[PDB]
Structures are given as C-alpha cells and as structure tokens.
Amino acid sequence: GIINTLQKYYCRVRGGRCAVLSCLPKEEQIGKCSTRGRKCCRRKK
C-alpha cells in the first residue's frame, strides 16, 4: 500500500526542538529526537 509514516525523520524533515526526557507542555511530539529516551516537540500554532 501507500506509506505515510516517517517518525524516523519527522523531526528531521521539519521538526523543531528536542527534549531530554519528556516533551514540552507548550509543544506536541512529532518524532524521536534521538533514539531512546528522547523525543521531538513542536510549539503549537
């Protein structure tokens, strides 16, 4: 079928910031900003 998932570079294509443990309350998660224990957060617009 057709692929639409890309959490492997969702933050690498147009992400934002990276958290150390948990994302920021002022932003949602779009993908992994590392590999284990971290994630990517993008400020809500």
Side-chain angles (χ1 to χ4, degrees):
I2 174 129
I3 185 159
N4 303 122
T5 350
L6 61 112
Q7 327 159 113
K8 262 81 76 258
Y9 16 82
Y10 224 148
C11 183
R12 173 90 31 114
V13 290
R14 58 122 49 177
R17 81 169 87 269
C18 306
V20 178
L21 316 119
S22 43
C23 248
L24 277 297
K26 295 161 93 284
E27 19 250 314
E28 56 166 282
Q29 209 206 278
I30 15 160
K32 329 256 164 203
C33 247
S34 200
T35 167
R36 212 254 151 121
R38 281 162 48 182
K39 329 109 135 75
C40 186
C41 330
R42 57 116 63 177
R43 225 186 279 218
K44 264 84 125 95
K45 262 119 182 137

Coordinates of all heavy atoms in Angstrom, one line a residue:
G1 N 0.8 -1.2 0.0 CA 0.0 0.0 0.0 C 0.8 1.3 0.0 O 2.0 1.2 -0.3
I2 N 0.2 2.4 0.3 CA 0.9 3.7 0.4 C 1.4 4.0 1.8 O 0.7 3.8 2.8 CB 0.0 4.8 -0.1 CG1 0.7 6.2 0.1 CG2 -1.3 4.8 0.7 CD1 0.7 7.0 -1.2
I3 N 2.7 4.5 1.9 CA 3.3 4.8 3.2 C 3.1 6.3 3.5 O 3.2 7.1 2.6 CB 4.8 4.5 3.2 CG1 5.4 4.7 4.6 CG2 5.5 5.3 2.1 CD1 6.6 4.0 4.8
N4 N 2.8 6.6 4.8 CA 2.6 8.0 5.2 C 3.3 8.2 6.5 O 3.4 9.4 6.9 CB 1.1 8.2 5.4 CG 0.3 8.0 4.1 OD1 -0.6 7.2 4.1 ND2 0.7 8.7 3.0
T5 N 3.9 7.2 7.1 CA 4.6 7.3 8.4 C 6.1 7.6 8.1 O 6.7 7.0 7.2 CB 4.4 6.0 9.2 OG1 3.5 5.2 8.7 CG2 4.1 6.4 10.7
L6 N 6.7 8.4 9.0 CA 8.1 8.8 8.9 C 8.6 9.3 10.2 O 9.3 10.3 10.2 CB 8.3 9.8 7.7 CG 7.5 11.1 7.9 CD1 8.5 12.2 8.1 CD2 6.7 11.4 6.7
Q7 N 8.2 8.7 11.3 CA 8.6 9.2 12.6 C 10.1 9.0 12.8 O 10.7 9.4 13.8 CB 7.9 8.4 13.7 CG 6.5 8.0 13.3 CD 6.0 6.8 14.2 OE1 5.1 7.0 15.0 NE2 6.6 5.6 14.0
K8 N 10.8 8.4 11.8 CA 12.2 8.2 11.8 C 13.0 9.5 11.4 O 14.2 9.6 11.6 CB 12.6 7.1 10.8 CG 12.8 5.8 11.5 CD 11.5 5.1 11.8 CE 10.9 4.5 10.5 NZ 9.8 5.3 9.9
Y9 N 12.3 10.5 10.8 CA 12.8 11.7 10.4 C 11.8 12.8 10.3 O 12.0 13.8 9.7 CB 13.5 11.6 9.0 CG 13.1 10.3 8.3 CD1 12.0 10.3 7.5 CD2 13.9 9.2 8.3 CE1 11.6 9.2 6.8 CE2 13.6 8.1 7.6 CZ 12.4 8.1 6.9 OH 12.0 6.9 6.2
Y10 N 10.7 12.6 11.0 CA 9.6 13.6 11.1 C 10.1 14.9 11.7 O 9.6 16.0 11.3 CB 8.4 13.1 11.9 CG 7.1 13.3 11.2 CD1 6.0 12.4 11.4 CD2 6.8 14.5 10.4 CE1 4.8 12.7 10.8 CE2 5.6 14.7 9.8 CZ 4.6 13.8 10.0 OH 3.4 14.0 9.5
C11 N 11.1 14.8 12.6 CA 11.6 16.0 13.2 C 12.9 16.4 12.5 O 13.5 17.5 12.7 CB 12.0 15.7 14.7 SG 12.6 17.1 15.6
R12 N 13.3 15.6 11.5 CA 14.5 15.9 10.7 C 14.1 16.5 9.4 O 14.9 17.2 8.7 CB 15.2 14.6 10.4 CG 16.4 14.7 9.5 CD 17.7 15.0 10.2 NE 17.7 14.4 11.5 CZ 18.6 13.4 11.9 NH1 19.5 13.0 11.0 NH2 18.6 13.0 13.1
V13 N 12.8 16.4 9.0 CA 12.3 17.0 7.8 C 11.8 18.4 8.0 O 11.9 19.3 7.1 CB 11.2 16.2 7.2 CG1 11.7 14.8 6.6 CG2 10.1 15.9 8.2
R14 N 11.3 18.7 9.2 CA 10.8 20.0 9.5 C 10.4 20.0 11.0 O 9.4 20.7 11.4 CB 9.6 20.3 8.6 CG 8.5 19.3 8.7 CD 7.2 20.0 9.2 NE 6.9 21.2 8.4 CZ 5.8 21.9 8.5 NH1 4.9 21.6 9.4 NH2 5.6 23.0 7.8
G15 N 11.1 19.4 11.9 CA 10.8 19.3 13.3 C 11.0 20.7 13.9 O 10.8 21.7 13.3
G16 N 11.4 20.6 15.2 CA 11.6 21.9 16.0 C 12.7 21.7 17.0 O 13.9 21.8 16.7
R17 N 12.3 21.5 18.2 CA 13.3 21.3 19.3 C 13.3 19.9 19.8 O 12.5 19.0 19.4 CB 12.9 22.3 20.5 CG 11.8 21.7 21.4 CD 11.7 22.6 22.7 NE 10.8 23.7 22.5 CZ 11.2 24.9 22.1 NH1 12.5 25.1 21.8 NH2 10.4 25.9 21.9
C18 N 14.2 19.6 20.8 CA 14.3 18.2 21.3 C 14.3 18.3 22.8 O 15.0 19.1 23.4 CB 15.6 17.6 20.8 SG 15.8 17.5 19.0
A19 N 13.7 17.3 23.4 CA 13.6 17.2 24.9 C 14.6 16.2 25.4 O 15.0 15.3 24.7 CB 12.2 16.9 25.4
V20 N 15.0 16.3 26.7 CA 15.9 15.3 27.3 C 15.2 14.1 27.7 O 15.7 13.0 27.6 CB 16.6 16.0 28.5 CG1 17.6 14.9 29.1 CG2 17.4 17.2 28.0
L21 N 14.0 14.2 28.3 CA 13.2 13.1 28.7 C 11.8 13.1 28.2 O 11.4 12.3 27.4 CB 13.2 13.1 30.3 CG 14.5 13.3 31.0 CD1 14.4 14.6 31.8 CD2 14.9 12.1 31.8
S22 N 11.0 14.1 28.7 CA 9.6 14.3 28.2 C 9.5 15.6 27.4 O 10.2 16.5 27.7 CB 8.7 14.3 29.4 OG 9.2 15.1 30.5
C23 N 8.6 15.6 26.5 CA 8.4 16.7 25.6 C 7.9 18.0 26.4 O 7.7 17.8 27.7 CB 7.3 16.5 24.6 SG 8.0 16.4 22.9
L24 N 7.8 19.1 25.8 CA 7.4 20.3 26.5 C 5.9 20.5 26.4 O 5.3 20.2 25.4 CB 8.1 21.5 25.9 CG 9.6 21.8 26.4 CD1 9.5 22.1 27.9 CD2 10.5 20.6 26.1
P25 N 5.3 21.0 27.5 CA 3.8 21.2 27.6 C 3.3 22.2 26.5 O 2.1 22.2 26.2 CB 3.6 21.7 29.0 CG 4.8 21.3 29.8 CD 5.9 21.3 28.8
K26 N 4.2 23.0 26.0 CA 3.9 24.0 25.0 C 4.1 23.5 23.6 O 4.0 24.3 22.6 CB 4.7 25.3 25.2 CG 4.4 26.0 26.5 CD 5.6 26.9 26.9 CE 5.3 28.3 26.4 NZ 5.6 28.5 24.9
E27 N 4.4 22.2 23.5 CA 4.6 21.6 22.2 C 4.2 20.1 22.1 O 4.2 19.5 23.2 CB 6.0 21.8 21.7 CG 7.0 22.1 22.9 CD 7.5 23.5 22.8 OE1 7.9 23.9 21.7 OE2 7.5 24.1 23.9
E28 N 3.8 19.7 20.9 CA 3.4 18.3 20.8 C 4.6 17.5 20.2 O 5.6 18.0 19.7 CB 2.2 18.2 19.9 CG 2.4 18.8 18.5 CD 1.4 18.4 17.5 OE1 1.5 17.3 16.9 OE2 0.4 19.2 17.3
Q29 N 4.5 16.1 20.3 CA 5.6 15.3 19.7 C 5.3 14.9 18.3 O 4.2 14.6 17.9 CB 5.7 14.0 20.6 CG 7.2 13.5 20.6 CD 7.2 12.0 20.9 OE1 7.2 11.6 22.0 NE2 7.3 11.2 19.8
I30 N 6.4 15.0 17.5 CA 6.3 14.6 16.1 C 7.2 13.4 15.7 O 6.9 12.8 14.7 CB 6.7 15.8 15.2 CG1 7.4 16.9 16.0 CG2 5.4 16.4 14.5 CD1 8.2 17.9 15.2
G31 N 8.2 13.2 16.5 CA 9.1 12.1 16.3 C 10.2 12.0 17.3 O 10.2 12.8 18.2
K32 N 11.1 11.0 17.1 CA 12.2 10.9 18.0 C 13.3 11.8 17.7 O 13.8 11.9 16.5 CB 12.7 9.4 18.0 CG 11.6 8.4 17.7 CD 11.1 7.6 18.9 CE 9.8 6.9 18.7 NZ 9.1 6.7 20.0
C33 N 13.8 12.5 18.7 CA 14.9 13.5 18.5 C 16.3 12.8 18.9 O 17.3 13.5 19.0 CB 14.7 14.7 19.4 SG 14.3 16.2 18.4
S34 N 16.3 11.5 19.1 CA 17.5 10.8 19.5 C 17.4 9.4 19.0 O 17.7 9.1 17.9 CB 17.7 10.9 21.0 OG 19.1 10.7 21.3
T35 N 17.1 8.5 19.9 CA 17.0 7.1 19.6 C 16.4 6.3 20.8 O 15.7 5.2 20.5 CB 18.4 6.5 19.3 OG1 18.3 5.0 19.3 CG2 19.4 6.9 20.3
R36 N 16.5 6.8 22.0 CA 16.0 6.1 23.1 C 16.0 7.0 24.4 O 17.0 7.3 24.9 CB 16.7 4.8 23.4 CG 15.9 3.7 24.1 CD 16.2 3.5 25.5 NE 15.0 3.0 26.3 CZ 15.0 1.9 27.0 NH1 16.1 1.2 27.0 NH2 13.9 1.5 27.6
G37 N 14.8 7.5 24.8 CA 14.7 8.3 26.0 C 14.4 9.8 25.6 O 14.2 10.6 26.5
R38 N 14.4 10.1 24.3 CA 14.2 11.5 23.9 C 13.1 11.5 22.8 O 12.8 10.5 22.2 CB 15.5 12.1 23.4 CG 16.4 12.6 24.5 CD 17.8 12.8 24.1 NE 17.9 13.6 22.8 CZ 19.0 13.9 22.2 NH1 20.2 13.5 22.7 NH2 19.0 14.6 21.1
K39 N 12.6 12.7 22.6 CA 11.6 12.9 21.6 C 11.7 14.4 21.0 O 12.4 15.2 21.5 CB 10.2 12.7 22.1 CG 10.1 11.7 23.2 CD 9.8 12.3 24.6 CE 8.8 11.6 25.4 NZ 9.3 10.3 26.0
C40 N 10.8 14.6 20.0 CA 10.8 16.0 19.4 C 9.5 16.7 19.6 O 8.4 16.1 19.5 CB 11.0 15.8 17.8 SG 11.2 17.5 17.0
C41 N 9.6 18.0 20.0 CA 8.4 18.8 20.2 C 8.3 20.0 19.4 O 9.3 20.6 19.1 CB 8.4 19.2 21.7 SG 9.2 18.0 22.8
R42 N 7.1 20.3 18.9 CA 6.9 21.5 18.0 C 5.9 22.4 18.7 O 4.7 22.0 18.9 CB 6.5 21.0 16.6 CG 5.2 20.2 16.6 CD 4.1 20.9 15.9 NE 4.4 21.1 14.5 CZ 3.6 21.7 13.6 NH1 2.4 22.0 14.0 NH2 3.9 21.8 12.3
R43 N 6.2 23.6 18.9 CA 5.3 24.6 19.5 C 4.0 24.7 18.8 O 4.0 24.8 17.6 CB 6.0 26.0 19.6 CG 5.9 26.7 20.9 CD 6.4 28.1 20.8 NE 7.9 28.2 21.0 CZ 8.5 29.1 21.7 NH1 7.8 30.1 22.2 NH2 9.8 29.0 21.8
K44 N 2.9 24.7 19.5 CA 1.6 24.7 19.0 C 1.4 26.1 18.3 O 1.7 27.1 18.9 CB 0.5 24.5 20.0 CG 0.0 23.0 20.1 CD 1.0 22.2 20.9 CE 0.2 21.4 22.0 NZ -0.2 20.1 21.6
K45 N 0.8 26.1 17.1 CA 0.5 27.3 16.4 C -1.0 27.7 16.5 O -1.3 28.9 16.7 CB 0.9 27.2 14.9 CG 2.3 27.8 14.6 CD 3.3 26.8 14.1 CE 4.6 27.4 13.9 NZ 5.7 26.5 14.4

